[PDB]
Design a binder for this molecule. Structure first.
Ligand SMILES: [Zn+2]
Lengths: 116, 108
């Protein structure tokens, strides 16, 4: 499944919930490979902007979510193989966070970067 | 980078000039900056910092458009109440070592 990796380096965004890094076109077309069932990001550019942030630190190629220490460090050991940023800065809208909590999905920030 | 803080444009005719950080974009791509223009109002082109004269640039004509105190001139240059309020890239300005002297504080 090449649908979980970028085709070019322009307009790349990172999913604020699972740190998946895809082109905004990929997010618009096929949605998030790990959050579309809870977000329904397919075919909605505005919702893609809301849930994915263009600004992130680092790139990590992930192949063995069940056999990677970096998967444990990044808490991405239950996600699909793809291009995963090291730190994704941002926060979801409050309504989406409450919707996830009502569904039962706890929202943990991916911004693991040390501030000051 | 803080709201109402002061930065300096790296390049352009406003290079090394003190510009107030009027607004910070949530996307962290650009910032709206307050500046005293350095423009000839299209009279000299076929400059020191001066208050934006809406009447002068309207009389000179050319690429100009006013909404009131707000004006769009010379390729999306935004001005308001004699002061430019234009968005500039965060990589196009220096965000440290900038402090207004008293003259810049009076200016902004
Ligand atoms: Zn995602």
């Amino acid at each position: 499944a090449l649908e979980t990796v970028p085709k070019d380096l322009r307009h790349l965004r990172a999913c604020l919930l699972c740190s998946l890094v895809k082109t905004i076109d990929q997010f618009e077309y096929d949605g998030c490979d790990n959050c579309d069932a809870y977000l329904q990001m397919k075919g909605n550019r505005e919702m893609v902007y809301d849930c994915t942030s263009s600004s992130f630190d680092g790139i990590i190629a992930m192949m063995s979510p069940e056999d990677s220490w970096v998967s444990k460090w990044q808490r991405v050991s239950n996600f699909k193989p793809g291009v995963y940023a090291v730190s994704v800065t941002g926060r979801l809208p409050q309504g989406i966070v409450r919707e996830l909590k009502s569904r039962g999905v706890a929202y943990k920030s991916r911004d693991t970067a040390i501030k000051t | 980078l803080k709201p109402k803080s002061w930065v300096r444009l790296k390049r352009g005719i406003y290079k090394d000039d003190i510009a107030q950080v009027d607004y910070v974009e949530p996307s962290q791509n650009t910032i709206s900056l307050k500046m005293i223009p350095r423009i000839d109002y299209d009279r000299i082109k076929a400059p020191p910092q001066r208050l934006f004269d809406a009447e002068k640039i309207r009389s000179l004509g050319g690429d100009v458009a006013s909404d009131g105190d707000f004006l769009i001139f010379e390729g999306n240059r935004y001005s308001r109440k004699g002061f430019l309020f234009k968005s500039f890239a965060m990589s196009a300005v220096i965000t440290e070592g900038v402090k207004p002297t008293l003259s810049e504080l009076e200016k902004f």
